[PDB]
């Protein structure tokens, strides 16, 4: 499986999830099962936590290729969380057995997608650039923010999500957008 | 888990490798090694049945203080394919130049 698009809407009102199953000749029998949303408060390493933010089952929506593509637009204010200060974790499950010719390593049923709001970072960069425009000196906080973002990126790409939550909550939690 | 075992095996192997090259490791670091393999023993035995998900959260967040603390304990690497800014591979397929009542329209 894979993600087509996974972002918060530019209006800061919807959390867009668009999932699709791989087009492979050995993934016909694989479908989509569910979408589970978790935040930095409920996140656990071993799969989706209990008491999740939003559980979604795909067979409710449809009445077979429809099962292989799913799109959602979840109004974030219905989820009762802050669109600026939340780090959504989107799990997806397959409910399907791939063929026996599947190459080693591709038969992964579960995936994960991290989501953050990029507006607050954008506004912070504009503030720091405005400070730079005066007297052409770079604030040290700007370099710190850049490198802290790089740290969170490395943590996410390496799968070390708990320390990413630590960094996010400590450094970027108070955000205006 | 099957990964705490690997982390602990690597940690003590590095510990005794240092004690082979050198004859000294910080006991402030041996304390972290001790915490690590105590947790490995406790979670992989008859004591794991008292673990809730809140307890698991706290245990993981306490263990990640050991991650880059020393050379022996190192940040684990997991299989992940995500990022903070995901890609947009959606394609645009207009139909008969057809605008809808207000919005545009595709297939």
């Amino acid at each position: 499986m894979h993600f087509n698009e996974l972002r918060i809407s530019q209006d800061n009102r919807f959390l867009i999830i668009d999932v699709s199953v791989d087009n492979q000749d050995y993934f016909e029998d694989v479908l989509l099962d569910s979408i589970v949303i978790d935040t930095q408060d409920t996140f656990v390493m071993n799969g989706p936590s209990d008491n999740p933010l939003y559980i979604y089952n795909v067979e409710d929506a449809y009445d077979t290729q429809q099962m292989k593509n799913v799109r959602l637009e979840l109004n974030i204010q219905d989820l009762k969380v802050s669109p600026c200060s939340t780090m959504f974790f989107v799990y997806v499950k397959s409910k399907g057995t791939p063929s026996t010719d599947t190459p080693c390593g591709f038969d992964k049923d579960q995936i994960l997608g991290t989501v953050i709001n990029l507006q607050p970072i954008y506004k912070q960069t504009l503030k720091y650039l405005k400070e730079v425009e005066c007297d052409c000196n770079i604030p040290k906080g700007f370099i710190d923010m850049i490198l802290k973002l790089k740290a969170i990126e490395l943590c996410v790409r390496t799968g070390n999500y708990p320390q990413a939550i630590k960094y996010w909550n400590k450094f970027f939690i108070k955000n205006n957008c | 888990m099957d990964k705490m075992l690997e982390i602990s095996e690597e940690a003590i192997t590095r510990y005794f490798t240092t004690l082979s090259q050198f004859g000294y490791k910080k006991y402030s670091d041996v304390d972290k090694i001790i915490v690590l393999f105590f947790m490995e023993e406790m979670l992989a035995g008859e004591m794991s049945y008292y673990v809730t998900q809140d307890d698991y959260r706290n245990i993981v967040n306490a263990l990640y203080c050991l991650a880059g603390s020393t050379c022996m304990i190192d940040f684990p690497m997991f299989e992940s394919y995500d990022t903070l800014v995901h890609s947009n591979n959606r394609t645009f397929v207009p139909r008969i130049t057809e605008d809808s009542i207000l919005r545009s329209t595709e297939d």
Binding site: - | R90, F92, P94, R103, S104, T105, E106
Partner: peptide, 25 residues
């Protein structure tokens, strides 16, 4: 005023947010 494929890609990604399919009526 020449456009490359990348600029058209940005136009696509902007326009896709505004348009939806038949099913979404």
């Amino acid at each position: 005023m020449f456009f490359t494929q990348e600029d058209y890609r940005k136009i696509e990604k902007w326009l896709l947010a505004n348009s939806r399919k038949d099913t979404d009526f």
